[PDB]
């Protein structure tokens, strides 16, 4: 199946952001999808999130863990532009300012860990 | 008769470069410290695949070849922690030379039998409660989580095993754990995902420093389709102990097969799979405070793999 960027054109995504930011100036439009290579973690019902700009990474990680119904014990990582987000007090507003896509959305993918074994 | 003892034959493998060699918090020179390097590497407890051991769960496998790779790596890093806890980082093994009783106590805990604290039997079966069928491949976090549960039954070691999730190390949670039953020896394991398909180059420097600390237990992970126990590095290469060799289960303890008496295998850091678990051992609170201090100083040139927070 197609990812978000594949289902909506660039100009179309730019418009989605213009509108949502117009209606919710204190919210950050975030796209969270399961990493293409991830195979153990479940797929979410929705991939579009509107996050209050004050919410920090610690809170985001936890609620997404909840959305996925994971135990604190299970491996979960939320990566932005290739790097994992640390469970800290950094506000999503700062991440948006430095990591957002040219289309206006902030993209994230989540994954767990690979397994190992030999022939 | 006069004999040629072929000194350093074992290093016919290792490179020449003068770049230092780091092994679990210790630095060495390939030029003048070959004997020291080999002694340190050979002393580490090495666990490979085994065959013909008692059937796991009565009707399960009698061998772990092909599926126990990450379980064996988990055993090796945890054994190093035990070694540091009961024998100390300065301890060294010598063939045919009498070793402390604590040594045989550590080795026994990893022998392939149901009654041993950290045997392949205990790990595989404890793994079922983690959603892992017996014979199913493991990732780093999964084996670390299973080891934490098995350590609860080990009163001899009385370890505090903390597995920091979400790339975060909460000091306050660790202190409460180590002061709860005053300080239980701390085994700190940190599961990470340093990239999507490859490791981001920004993490390489931080990873190197993770092997340069006194508290360093090394790292478990591997190349795609090959789990390894990384004990250090030299240049742009990681050095490790490989479990991919099947040996007969020890049927009595003759321990030669549990020591790799050769310079360690090497692999380019760039080939490292992003899924790993970094480990640290802090004997006392002062050791832990020293560790935190060191992590804080890593705010150098090199993005951090994990963050240290108080609460």
From Swiss-Prot, chain A:
Annotated membrane topology is: Lipid-anchor
Mind listing the GO molecular function terms for this protein? Answer: ceramide binding; microtubule binding; phosphatidylethanolamine binding; protein domain specific binding; tubulin binding; ubiquitin protein ligase binding
Tissue distribution = Abundant only in neurons. Detected in testes.
Q: Where in the cell is it found?
A: Cytoplasmic vesicle, Autophagosome membrane; Endomembrane system; Mitochondrion membrane; Cytoplasm, Cytoskeleton
Q: What is its main location?
A: membrane
* Entry keyword annotation includes Cytoplasm: yes
Question: Which residues are the lipid attachment points (Phosphatidylethanolamine amidated glycine)?
Answer: 117
BP terms from Gene Ontology: autophagosome assembly; autophagosome maturation; autophagy; cellular response to nitrogen starvation; cellular response to starvation; establishment of localization in cell; macroautophagy; mitophagy
Q: Which domain of life is it from?
A: Eukaryota
| Keyword field | Autophagy, Cytoplasm, Cytoplasmic vesicle, Cytoskeleton, Lipoprotein, Membrane, Microtubule, Mitochondrion, Phosphoprotein, Ubl conjugation, Ubl conjugation pathway
Q: Where is this site: Cleavage?
A: 117-118
Q: How is it modified after translation?
A: The precursor molecule is cleaved by ATG4 (ATG4A, ATG4B, ATG4C or ATG4D) to expose the glycine at the C-terminus and form the cytosolic form, LC3-I. The processed form is then activated by APG7L/ATG7, transferred to ATG3 and conjugated to phosphatidylethanolamine (PE) phospholipid to form the membrane-bound form, LC3-II. During non-canonical autophagy, the processed form is conjugated to phosphatidylserine (PS) phospholipid. ATG4 proteins also mediate the delipidation of PE-conjugated forms. Phosphorylation by PKA inhibits conjugation of phosphatidylethanolamine (PE). Interaction with MAPK15 reduces the inhibitory phosphorylation and increases autophagy activity.
The UniProt record lists lipidation (Phosphatidylserine amidated glycine) at 117
GO cellular component annotations of the record:
autolysosome; autophagosome; autophagosome membrane; axon; axoneme; cytoplasmic vesicle; dendrite; endomembrane system
Q: How does it assemble?
A: 3 different light chains, LC1 (a cleavage product of MAP1B), LC2 (a cleavage product of MAP1A) and LC3 (produced by one of the MAP1LC3 genes), can associate with the MAP1A or MAP1B heavy chains. Interacts at microtubules with CABP1 (via EF-hands 1 and 2) but not with calmodulin. Interacts with FYCO1 (via C-terminus). Interacts with TP53INP1 and TP53INP2. Interacts with TBC1D25. Directly interacts with SQSTM1; this interaction leads to MAP1LC3B recruitment to inclusion bodies containing polyubiquitinated protein aggregates and to inclusion body degradation by autophagy. Interacts with ATG4B.
Function, as annotated: Ubiquitin-like modifier involved in formation of autophagosomal vacuoles (autophagosomes). Plays a role in mitophagy which contributes to regulate mitochondrial quantity and quality by eliminating the mitochondria to a basal level to fulfill cellular energy requirements and preventing excess ROS production.
* Entry similarity comment: Belongs to the ATG8 family.
The identity of this protein, by name, is Microtubule-associated protein 1 light chain 3 beta
UniProtKB/Swiss-Prot annotation, chain B:
* Free-text function comment from the UniProt entry: Cysteine protease that plays a key role in autophagy by mediating both proteolytic activation and delipidation of ATG8 family proteins. Required for canonical autophagy (macroautophagy), non-canonical autophagy as well as for mitophagy. The protease activity is required for proteolytic activation of ATG8 family proteins: cleaves the C-terminal amino acid of ATG8 proteins MAP1LC3A, MAP1LC3B, MAP1LC3C, GABARAPL1, GABARAPL2 and GABARAP, to reveal a C-terminal glycine.
Which SUPFAM superfamilies does this chain map to?
Cysteine proteinases
Q: What is the protein name for this chain?
A: Cysteine protease ATG4B
Q: Name one Pfam family in it.
A: ATG4_LIR
Reaction catalysed by this chain? [protein]-C-terminal L-amino acid-glycyl-phosphatidylethanolamide + H2O = [protein]-C-terminal L-amino acid-glycine + a 1,2-diacyl-sn-glycero-3-phosphoethanolamine; [protein]-C-terminal L-amino acid-glycyl-phosphatidylserine + H2O = [protein]-C-terminal L-amino acid-glycine + a 1,2-diacyl-sn-glycero-3-phospho-L-serine
Q: How is its activity regulated?
A: Inhibited by N-ethylmaleimide. Redox-regulated during autophagy since reducing conditions activate ATG4A whereas an oxidizing environment such as the presence of H(2)O(2) inhibits its activity. The cysteine protease activity compounds is inhibited by styrylquinoline compounds 4-28 and LV-320.
Q: Which GO terms describe its biological process?
A: aggrephagy; autophagosome assembly; autophagy; macroautophagy; microautophagy; mitophagy; otolith mineralization completed early in development; piecemeal microautophagy of the nucleus
Q: Which residue positions does S-nitrosocysteine occur at?
A: 260
Q: What is the effect of changing residue 137 to A?
A: Strongly reduced protease activity
Active site residues of this protein:
69 (nucleophile), 242, 244
Q: How is it modified after translation?
A: Phosphorylation at Ser-275 by ULK1 inhibits autophagy by decreasing both proteolytic activation and delipidation activities. Phosphorylation at Ser-275 is dephosphorylated by protein phosphatase 2A (PP2A). Phosphorylation at Ser-29 by AKT2 promotes its hydrolase activity, leading to increased proteolytic activation and delipidation of ATG8 family proteins.
- The superkingdom listed in its UniProt entry is Eukaryota
Quote the annotated effect of residue 282 to S. Answer: Does not affect formation of disulfide bonds
Q: What is its EC number?
A: 3.4.22.-
Question: Mutating residue 29 to D: what's the consequence?
Answer: Phospho-mimetic mutant; increased proteolytic activation of ATG8 family proteins
Q: Note the subunit structure.
A: Interacts with PFKP; promoting phosphorylation of ATG4B at Ser-29. Interacts with GBP7.
Q: Which residues get modified to Phosphoserine?
A: 29, 275
Protein keywords: Acetylation, Autophagy, Cytoplasm, Cytoplasmic vesicle, Disulfide bond, Endoplasmic reticulum, Glycoprotein, Hydrolase, Isopeptide bond, Mitochondrion, Phosphoprotein, Protease, Protein transport, S-nitrosylation, Thiol protease, Transport, Ubl conjugation, Ubl conjugation pathway
InterPro entries referenced in this protein's UniProt entry, alphabetically: ATG4_LIR (IPR046793), Papain-like_cys_pep_sf (IPR038765), Peptidase_C54 (IPR005078), Peptidase_C54_cat (IPR046792)
According to its UniProt record, where is this protein located?
Cytoplasm; Cytoplasm, Cytosol; Cytoplasmic vesicle, Autophagosome; Endoplasmic reticulum
């Amino acid at each position: 199946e197609k990812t978000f960027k594949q289902r909506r054109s660039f100009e179309q995504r730019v418009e989605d952001v213009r509108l949502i930011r117009e209606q919710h100036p204190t919210k950050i439009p975030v796209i969270i999808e399961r990493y293409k290579g991830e195979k153990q973690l479940p797929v979410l019902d929705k991939t579009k999130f509107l996050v209050p700009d004050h919410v920090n990474m610690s809170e985001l990680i936890k609620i997404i863990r909840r959305r996925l119904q994971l135990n604190a014990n299970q491996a979960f990582f939320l990566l932005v532009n290739g790097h994992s987000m640390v469970s800290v007090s950094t506000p999503i507003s700062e991440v948006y300012e430095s990591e957002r896509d040219e289309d206006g959305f902030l993209y994230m993918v989540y994954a767990s860990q690979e397994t190992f074994g030999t022939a | 008769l006069t004999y040629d003892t072929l000194r350093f034959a074992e290093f016919e493998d290792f490179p020449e470069t003068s770049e230092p060699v780091w092994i679990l918090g210790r630095k060495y020179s390939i030029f003048t410290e070959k004997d020291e390097i080999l002694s340190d590497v050979a002393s580490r407890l090495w666990f490979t695949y085994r065959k013909n051991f008692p059937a796991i769960g009565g009707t399960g496998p009698t061998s772990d070849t092909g599926w126990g790779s990450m379980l064996r790596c988990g055993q090796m890093i945890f054994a190093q922690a035990l070694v540091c806890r009961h024998l100390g980082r300065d301890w060294r093994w010598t063939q045919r030379k009498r070793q402390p009783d604590s040594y045989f106590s550590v080795l026994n805990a990893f022998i392939d039998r149901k009654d041993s604290y950290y045997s392949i039997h205990q790990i595989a079966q404890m793994g079922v409660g983690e959603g892992k069928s017996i014979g199913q491949w493991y990732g780093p976090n999964t084996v670390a989580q299973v080891l934490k549960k098995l350590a609860v039954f080990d009163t001899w070691s009385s370890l505090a095993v903390h597995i920091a999730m979400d790339n975060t190390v909460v000091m306050e949670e660790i202190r409460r754990l180590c002061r709860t039953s005053p300080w239980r020896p701390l085994v700190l394991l940190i599961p990470l995902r340093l990239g999507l398909t490859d490791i981001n180059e920004a993490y390489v420097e931080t990873l190197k420093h993770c092997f340069m600390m006194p508290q360093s237990l090394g790292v478990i992970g591997g190349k795609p389709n090959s789990a390894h126990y990384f004990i250090g590095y030299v240049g742009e290469e990681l050095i490790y102990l490989d479990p991919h060799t099947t040996q007969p289960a020890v049927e009595p303890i003759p321990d030669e097969s549990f020591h790799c008496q050769h310079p360690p295998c090497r692999m380019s850091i760039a080939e490292l799979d992003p899924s790993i678990a970094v480990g640290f051992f802090c004997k006392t609170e002062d050791d832990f405070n020293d560790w935190c201090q060191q992590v804080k100083k890593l705010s150098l040139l090199a993005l951090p793999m994990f963050e240290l927070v108080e609460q």
